[PDB]
């Protein structure tokens, strides 16, 4: 859906989730580290957090987790199924409000 940004760098995902976002705002963008992959950037609790999405050819996951056929149902599944994302012994991550 429109939560997808193909044009944007890691820095612009920071500048948009900070100025225009609220906690729970997220977006998917191309990865600067891994080309042809995507990272989610989530504004959680004051700051921006990036999560690498893994695309293996055969599926999309978040480097572990349930496997999905397309990017779009991955975000759908995590927007709908609250609570499955815990940062390593940190807080939960909520993918709440699609950004722009």
């Amino acid at each position: 859906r429109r939560w997808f940004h193909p044009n944007i760098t890691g820095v612009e995902a920071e500048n948009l989730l900070l100025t225009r976002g609220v906690d729970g705002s997220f977006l998917a963008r191309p990865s600067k580290s891994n080309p042809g992959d995507f990272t989610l950037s989530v504004r959680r609790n004051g700051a921006v957090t990036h999560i690498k999405i893994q695309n293996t050819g055969d599926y999309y996951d978040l480097y572990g987790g349930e496997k999905f056929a397309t990017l779009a149902e991955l975000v759908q599944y995590y927007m709908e199924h609250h609570g499955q994302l815990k940062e390593k012994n940190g807080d939960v991550i909520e993918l709440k409000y699609p950004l722009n």
């Binding site: 990272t39 921006v48 990036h50 999560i51 987790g65």
Partner: peptide
């Protein structure tokens, strides 16, 4: 700016 890794 943290690249977080999730624990499932």
């Amino acid at each position: 700016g943290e690249y977080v890794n999730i624990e499932f």
